[PDB]
Amino acid sequence: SMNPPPPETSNPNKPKRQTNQLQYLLRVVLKTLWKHQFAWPFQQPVDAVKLNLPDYYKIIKTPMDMGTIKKRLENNYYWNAQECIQDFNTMFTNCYIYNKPGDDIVLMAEALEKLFLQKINELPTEE
Template sequence: MIGVTGHKWAGPFMQPVDVVGLGLHDYYEIIEKPMDFSTIKNKMEAKDGSGYKNVREICADVRLIFKNAMKYNDERNDVHVMAKTLLAKFEEKWLLLLPKVDEEEERRKKEEAEAQLDIQLAQEVSHAKMAKELNTELDVIGKRLEKMRETVLRNCRKMSTEEKKALMTVLTQLSPDDLNKALLIVAENNPSFQATGQEVDLDIDAQSESTLWKLKFFVKDLLQSQGKSPTSIGGNTTTTTVNNNNQNKRKRETNDGPAKPSQKKNKKPS
């Protein structure tokens, strides 16, 4: 251990103190942690993870060997003198070795930091891959759900005349942004429908059942998000619809405002 174990006085410190053989009945009362060079050697060679983590830990145990001997034995005792002499020689050797120890520690810290960075980058790549795969799966699920929704809408019952009137009433009361969203729903299934202009002529009876139900679900969700009752999409509201249309038309003529749907009157069955 840095040249100390080869010294002629190293013998008493090579093996654990024979407490029983030497009759040192108070040894463990004075020495809290016994130490010797054979114990240090075994710990250096340990393969189970219980060994030293760095040179400084070894150095601390070497010091402990000599400090234990000096603590237990009187200053005039030969063992005390031998321990004190060997400790001084050890400190001299340690000072010479210290720059290399510092250099080695810096190198290890750098390697550990680089290894940690590599692990972090690998984890980020893995997480990015997982996120991409998850997004792909969600897209597939979303498309399937949309197809299922389209199927459900195609098989919906026919909307009644009263329901159409109520739906038209709600549409005329929407904000410009929400109205544009509703008109885009109509345009999705009706390429010839023009969702632009100061006044949009929306023939509610000419729309497919799936378009009508999409509009109803849209305004229902919209009303719920605004804290209003979805039941407002129902009942006999023909008069209200006409009044709202007339008011909207007057506003457009005066303020050149956003587009509003105009309701075509439903034909009475013959």
Template sequence: MSCSKRSESSLAPPAPPGLSKKCKHHPSSSPPPPAAAPGSAGGTADLGGAFVRCGKLLDKLLEHEDGWVFAEPVDARALRLVDYYTYITDPMDLGTVHRRLERRRYADPQAFAADVRLTFRNAMSYNSPGDPVYESAVELSGIFESEWASVLASPPPPTDAERRGRLAGELPRLPLGAQLMVVEIMKRQDGCLTGENGMAQVDLDKADTATLDELDQLVAEHGASLAGVVNWKQETRVLDN
């Protein structure tokens, strides 16, 4: 049986004159990525980045001039909304979403989005069009939906310059045998390898995209798990074979 909506609003009473009606919301620090599962390093990094973007979008909603309306659970008793829980069987608010995100309670970004959408859906279900709470929910829901795609979007691939910088830190930590394989890879590029004091120098700035791909694959196969026995600098030093 369908039930008519209440005509009165679930909006909290306005603040006294001279006081801001906004709640004091402090943007959260980026939530830490979920614990890594074996063999899922790349996927975990992507998931962690998505949760960071979830936090930023949630902060934007809470910092909106109407965000305070949804920042805490609806206090039906204080607002004398005697039938609120008759119509709203699954209450949700952005403050609860914020706490769940900080405590890593969401398995994936879609679960986070479901709670945000539930918050606004509840507000639009209990209140009628034209009501301040209803209209605020419509506005914030529109902001959320317009930016949600960017939360799920994969980050752009790293540039070759970024890859060189990362490899300069990873290659020295490879096991010695893998470091010697780095030498063999770089030998195939003219000008990438020069001898100095019995050592071999690898200049990553001269490595092309294909060579960087090979080095990335080497790191993926052997893992940057051990500190190198050679002290590499910007021009990475590797033992010559």
């Protein structure tokens, strides 16, 4: 069994930007979620080999995780905050698609997602 290559965190053909919203997304949103009690299963790409999940990358074709998002934010990979918010939303969506309602991993995603939504409800106005 093989894992796909991870999502890219650098691309010299992609224009980069730093905005107050993206720095809020790193300094407040990512950092808070990273330190959460249930953040461990989301801090790196799903290793479907080691977790013996051979259908995972059969079913999930846009994988995403907070390790990738952290590296994208640290590298200023994004142009705008919506790009980064979409990556979080994809991470959560994948978990809910692949797993079953009420699974442990889904209960953990639920907690992180509730905090995520509280933080982006207060996304600062673009300056």
